[PDB]
Write a protein that binds this ligand. Structure first.
Ligand SMILES: [Zn+2]
Ligand SMILES: [Zn+2]
Lengths: 43, 262, 59, 93, 68, 391, 125, 37, 50, 90
């Protein structure tokens, strides 16, 4: 998939809308999902 | 907003601020540029009911405060995350679900760019069409070998073509006005033209009166709700019939003169 | 002329519902006549309309 | 002085993610044609943060929310992209 | 072009020689009113009292008098 | 709506019913509105579809209006277009992209939250300080240390950016704050766009150079006005092209008859009209016989592309093919050589000479000439390296 | 025409409902003119469990036959597992799986390395 | 593949009108059933 | 192809002004109609009983 | 409704004979109306695949592309009089 500019705008709106245990078992992919999603909507 | 999908929307476009060949052409070019923008804002494809928005928004926003079944929930969650990945990444073997675009769908459609593109107002030609049509009619003519190829022939085929064209146009008009909603539309337009003609008449005859030798009940409810056979004088029917019969009175003699000529 | 000077949607719809009300379900005059009518003053608020209506429901 | 790129702009999302957000370990050998110490520390900090967000020990008692010490390392590159896009007007003739 | 325009002008001059109604008999198959020719009468649905006022105003405008 | 109560509506029994039933009155009103709109729909559909019966195309050009050039396929062709010049493609697209970045609200909510942050500098909801403490030394080498230092200078570099340029909404670089929001209405956003000169970038905005109204000066009516007029003509021509594409997508004749281009001439019979309306309906649009059969088109093209000689070239004395003149590790191993290519030779050579330009962190604007992109970046790096020896 | 809120949503909802109703009537008819044999356990296992990825192994062990998981606790654990898988696939999309970047993009996005046919046909088949 | 009549009939402005008319029709059908009191 | 679009328009508007707005079924519909109060309230203004 | 699970291998041949449902090429010689002039075999095939796989996007995307064709016109990369030539295109 390659988004057009309008679909990129839809992605930015969805990502900026959405949201509104021991360290061992924590997955190795434990990053900030919202920050990575928005840094993917850009670039 | 209320007159959006109608021909009476290109008359509000000329009532905006300045927005700035003739000045009317410049204003029309400015309105086309204003329609070109707000499509370049890339907000037209956004819909609040898109499956893409329901993937993020209505999935974190619904939980709120508030094989078998388990491996039917796991696969559903995996499919939802697969669609989210396809909408964001270079994920493979996932097909996206589209949405109906409802904002600024075709900005180039509700514009009249014809008078600007054909270089009018600054300062192509038809009629090869009918010449080619009658030329093909003559050149082929279907041959009336059943009347042993008569001499006239092309005259008969041209008469058939003209009769068929006239009858097709008239049949289309009659079939269009045979719809009761089309008759409602005609009645509404006739009422509007009567009131506007009264305004014209008021102004004009008042001027040519002082220039000599120099509420809904009355206002479109008892007309819109009544059968128009009632509120229409027989005078206008007789007038239209007299005009029609005066116009089409020389048709037999002109037909005889055309067909009996060379 | 005959096609354009024909009843529109409003006049056609007021011709079938009007028939249904004042022409088809106005046959209840024979019912209310065999049970009881006064007519004439059965207009206004005689209060026998309510009794006739509930008697028509009860049958 | 004119419009040009820079290596300091860090236009690559792979750079911006292997340096700031994604810290994993790959075990393979190359076939066709990075301060591990720091990476392990950042991964452990990431794990502690995820854990804390999972036991709802933050003021916002939600597992996933919107932080607002917004990342300068992301807002700066968004502004850089906008500036380089709007400064192309001086690239005429 | 002059021949085509002359044919149209000959048709128009024939209509001018027709002029008015004189010389033509009344026809029982073609009365002067289409409501006579067809069978078009107003009935119970559509006719209302105010329609007389509107009819008066339309007839005044059709006759050509500025009174109502 | 309270109406149908006077004497003026006395006589109709259904109106007499609707006197005492407001729900019937409202049903009548809504039904009459819906019936009128249905009549509008019927009439508009007829007015859309019935002109399609009256369209006839030229039989010589098949409705195109342009024919292949008699010579050369020149002084008989058209006069090319603005976009055929391949040397100016990247400059034209760069200026267009710079213009479109003004309108682009793809990063709209992000710039809105940045605007709110710089408006009210009293925010909250931090809840965890980022640790993010490793700019280790000005020493050592590699790529990790350089990228990590450039990533750790983000706060001071962002302060420099906000001091030199500020927010785009505070300098009108973007469209501004919430002016065009979807889901509001098509028409409120049109009003907001028509407000001031929001449909134009500040490079063409009239309310930026009116202060130079005395004596003209920097040609606010001769350069800025010319640029704005050219931009408006380009967007109007884009709308015309989109209308032509929309008409071509449904097999209809194109409404806008464009002038012939550098490979085409006007049609002999039309002159460029290519189609027109007429009183006589089209019997190809009717009865569906508008498009030719595929086998018939194949037979026509095969016979046209395969001429045959019915005379043996020994009785007629012909020894050569038809034409004039008559008597008479490359292109067979590798195959030809590109012709449109050649202006990018210097950039290709420089990209091969300096492999560091292939860095993923580097993003040049793009271009082929000495001015723009790779050569501009290399000249900037060389000027910096020369001037750091003197400082 | 349809329920009020928007016609832009109820029209795809009606198309989806028609497609899924046609699927549910195509099924339950091919379970009456062709009722299920042990295929109901063969094609619903194995080929479905293979599509189930990692990070669901913990919840599959816990909720199914190893413990209990209530209703909202089960949904919360399923959401957590789905988000772990989502983050893993985002990482696999940008920096790759457990392999280098020169295979994450260079041979994968650029479609070099043609699919294994000689080895997968001789050594395997 | 260019369904011009259906694209014209299901244009966004016409869809907005159909939504408004469905709202009015549903409200005036409810008002007429809930009046049974 | 020329006649179906008129039927489509007519049906599409019939769904909104007849199916939803104003229905009209046959048979026994006494208990659903308050209209009959007005209907018997104008009986002396209707045709002489016969 | 019924439970008579008849077994026959000619039903595959009958289902293959229901390719006339897909193409509607039998309609003129059977009824007089050439429905193949208006039927969309690709849309029928997409609907059949969507029904079989329980994936309604396969049919819905094609139907929406057919309806909203104008919005599928190229609006990215075609900005402001993007005509080259016939000769440059050649
Ligand atoms: Zn031509
Ligand atoms: Zn030439």
């Amino acid at each position: 998939n390659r988004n057009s500019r309008g679909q990129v705008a839809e992605q930015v709106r969805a990502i900026l809308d959405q949201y509104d245990a021991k360290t061992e078992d924590m997955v190795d992919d434990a990053f900030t999902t919202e920050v990575v999603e928005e840094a993917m909507a850009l670039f | 907003n209320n007159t959006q999908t109608n021909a009476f929307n290109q008359n509000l476009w000329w009532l905006l601020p300045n927005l700035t060949i003739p000045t009317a052409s410049k204003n029309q070019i400015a309105l086309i540029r204003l329609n070109w923008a707000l499509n370049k804002t890339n907000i037209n494809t956004f819909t609040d009911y898109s499956k893409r928005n329901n993937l993020w928004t209505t999935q974190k926003l619904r939980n709120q405060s508030k094989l078998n079944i388990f491996s039917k929930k796991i696969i559903s969650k995996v499919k939802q995350k697969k669609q989210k990945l396809n909408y964001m990444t270079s994920y493979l073997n996932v097909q996206s679900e589209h949405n109906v675009k409802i904002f600024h769908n075709s900005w180039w459609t509700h514009l009249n760019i014809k008078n600007l593109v054909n270089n009018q107002d600054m300062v192509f030609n038809s009629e090869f069409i009918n010449s080619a049509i009658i030329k093909s009619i003559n050149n082929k003519t279907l041959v009336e070998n059943y009347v042993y190829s008569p001499s006239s022939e092309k005259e008969t085929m041209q008469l058939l073509l003209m009769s068929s064209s006239i009858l097709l146009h008239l049949c289309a008009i009659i079939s269009l006005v045979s719809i009761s909603q089309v008759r409602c539309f005609v009645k509404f337009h006739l009422i509007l033209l009567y009131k506007l003609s009264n305004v014209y008449n008021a102004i004009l005859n008042q001027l040519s009166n002082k220039l000599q030798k120099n509420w809904i009940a009355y206002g479109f409810l008892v007309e819109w709700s009544s059968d128009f056979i009632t509120i229409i004088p027989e005078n206008v029917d007789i007038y239209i019939w007299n005009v029609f019969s005066k116009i089409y009175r020389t048709i037999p003699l002109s037909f005889i003169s055309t067909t009996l000529g060379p | 002329f005959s096609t354009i000077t024909q009843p529109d949607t409003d006049l056609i719809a007021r011709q079938e519902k009007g028939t249904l009300f004042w022409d088809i379900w106005a046959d209840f005059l024979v019912t209310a006549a065999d049970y009881y009518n006064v007519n004439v003053a059965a207009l206004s608020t005689i209060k026998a309309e309510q009794n006739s209506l509930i008697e028509n429901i009860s049958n | 002085t004119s419009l040009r790129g820079s290596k300091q702009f860090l236009n690559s999302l792979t750079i911006l993610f292997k340096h700031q957000k994604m810290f994993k370990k790959k075990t393979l050998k190359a076939h066709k044609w990075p301060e591990e110490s720091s990476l392990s520390t950042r991964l452990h900090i990431q794990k502690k943060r995820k854990a804390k967000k999972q036991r709802l020990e933050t003021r916002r008692q939600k597992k996933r929310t919107r932080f607002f010490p917004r990342p300068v390392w992301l807002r700066s590159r968004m502004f850089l992209n906008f500036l380089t896009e709007r400064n192309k007007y001086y690239l005429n003739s | 072009a002059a021949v085509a325009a002359g044919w149209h002008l000959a048709s128009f001059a024939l209509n001018l020689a027709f002029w008015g109604v004189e010389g033509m008999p009344p026809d029982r198959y073609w009365p002067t009113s289409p409501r006579i020719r067809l069978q078009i009468r107003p009935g119970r649905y559509g006719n209302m009292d105010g329609g007389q006022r509107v009819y008066m105003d339309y007839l005044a405008r059709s006759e050509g008098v500025p009174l109502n | 709506m309270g109406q149908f109560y006077s004497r003026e509506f006395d006589g109709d029994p259904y109106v007499d019913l609707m006197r005492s039933l407001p729900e019937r009155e409202l049903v009548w009103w809504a039904q009459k509105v819906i019936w009128l709109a249905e009549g509008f729909t019927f009439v508009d559909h007829f007015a859309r579809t019935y002109p399609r019966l009256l369209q006839h195309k030229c039989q010589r050009c098949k409705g195109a209006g342009v024919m292949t050039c008699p010579a050369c396929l020149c002084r008989v062709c058209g006069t090319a277009c603005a976009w055929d010049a391949e040397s100016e493609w990247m400059e034209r697209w760069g200026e267009w992209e710079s213009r479109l970045a003004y309108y682009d609200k793809a990063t709209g909510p992000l710039m809105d939250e940045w605007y709110e942050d710089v408006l009210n500098a009293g925010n909250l909801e931090e809840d965890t300080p980022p640790v993010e403490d490793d700019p280790p030394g000005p020493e050592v080498t590699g790529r990790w240390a350089e990228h990590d230092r450039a990533l750790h200078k983000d706060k001071k570099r962002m302060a420099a950016l906000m001091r030199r340029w500020g927010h785009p909404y505070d300098a009108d670089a973007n469209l501004g704050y919430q002016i065009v929001d979807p889901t509001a209405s098509m028409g409120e956003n049109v009003w907001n766009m028509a407000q001031v000169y929001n449909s134009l970038p500040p490079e063409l905005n009239p309310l930026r150079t009116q202060h130079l109204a005395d004596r003209g000066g920097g040609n606010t009516q001769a350069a800025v006005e010319a640029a704005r007029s050219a931009f408006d003509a380009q967007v109007v021509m884009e709308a015309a092209l989109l209308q032509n594409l929309e008409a071509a997508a449904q097999d209809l004749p194109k409404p806008h008859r464009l002038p012939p281009t550098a490979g085409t001439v006007a049609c002999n019979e039309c002159g460029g009209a290519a189609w027109g309306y007429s009183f006589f309906p089209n019997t190809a649009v009717m009865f569906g016989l508008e498009r030719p059969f595929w086998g018939d088109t194949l037979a026509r093209l095969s016979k046209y592309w395969n001429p045959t000689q019915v005379a043996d070239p020994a009785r007629t004395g012909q020894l050569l093919p038809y034409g004039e003149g008559g008597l008479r590790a490359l292109e067979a191993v590798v195959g030809k050589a590109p012709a449109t290519t050649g202006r990018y030779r210097r950039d290709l050579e420089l990209l091969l000479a300096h492999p560091e330009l292939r860095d993923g962190a580097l993003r040049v604007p793009g271009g082929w000439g000495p001015e723009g992109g790779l050569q501009t970046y290399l000249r900037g790096q060389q000027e910096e390296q020369a001037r750091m020896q003197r400082r | 025409d349809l329920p009020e809120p928007r016609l832009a949503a109820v029209m795809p909802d009606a198309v989806y409902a028609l497609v899924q109703g046609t699927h549910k009537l195509g099924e339950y008819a091919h379970d009456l003119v062709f009722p299920p044999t042990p295929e109901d356990l063969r094609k619903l296992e194995q080929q479905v469990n293979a599509t189930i990825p990692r990070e669901f192994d913990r919840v599959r062990q816990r909720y199914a036959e190893g413990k209990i998981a209530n209703d909202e606790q089960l949904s919360s654990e399923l959401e957590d597992a789905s988000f772990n898988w989502y983050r893993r696939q985002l990482r696999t999309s940008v920096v790759g799986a457990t392999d280098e970047e020169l295979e994450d993009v260079a041979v994968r996005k650029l479609r070099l390395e043609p699919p294994a046919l000689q080895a997968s046909l001789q050594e395997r088949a | 593949e260019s369904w011009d009549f259906l694209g014209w009939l299901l244009a966004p402005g016409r869809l907005e009108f159909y939504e408004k008319a469905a709202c009015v029709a549903i409200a005036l059908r409810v008002l007429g059933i809930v009046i049974a009191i | 192809r020329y006649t179906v679009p008129f039927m489509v328009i007519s049906g599409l508007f019939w769904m909104i002004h007849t199916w939803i707005l104003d229905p009209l079924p046959n048979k026994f519909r006494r208990q659903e109609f308050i209209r009959y109060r007005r209907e018997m309230l104008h009986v002396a203004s209707k045709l002489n009983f016969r | 409704e019924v439970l008579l699970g008849q077994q026959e291998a000619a039903k595959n041949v009958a289902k293959q004979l229901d390719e006339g449902v897909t193409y509607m090429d039998w309609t003129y010689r059977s009824t007089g109306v050439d429905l193949s002039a208006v039927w969309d075999p690709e849309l029928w095939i997409r609907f059949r695949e969507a029904v079989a796989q329980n994936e309604p996007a396969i049919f819905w995307n094609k139907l929406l592309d057919r309806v909203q064709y104008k919005e599928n016109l190229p609006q990215a990369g075609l900005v402001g009089d993007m005509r080259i030539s016939y000769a440059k295109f050649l």
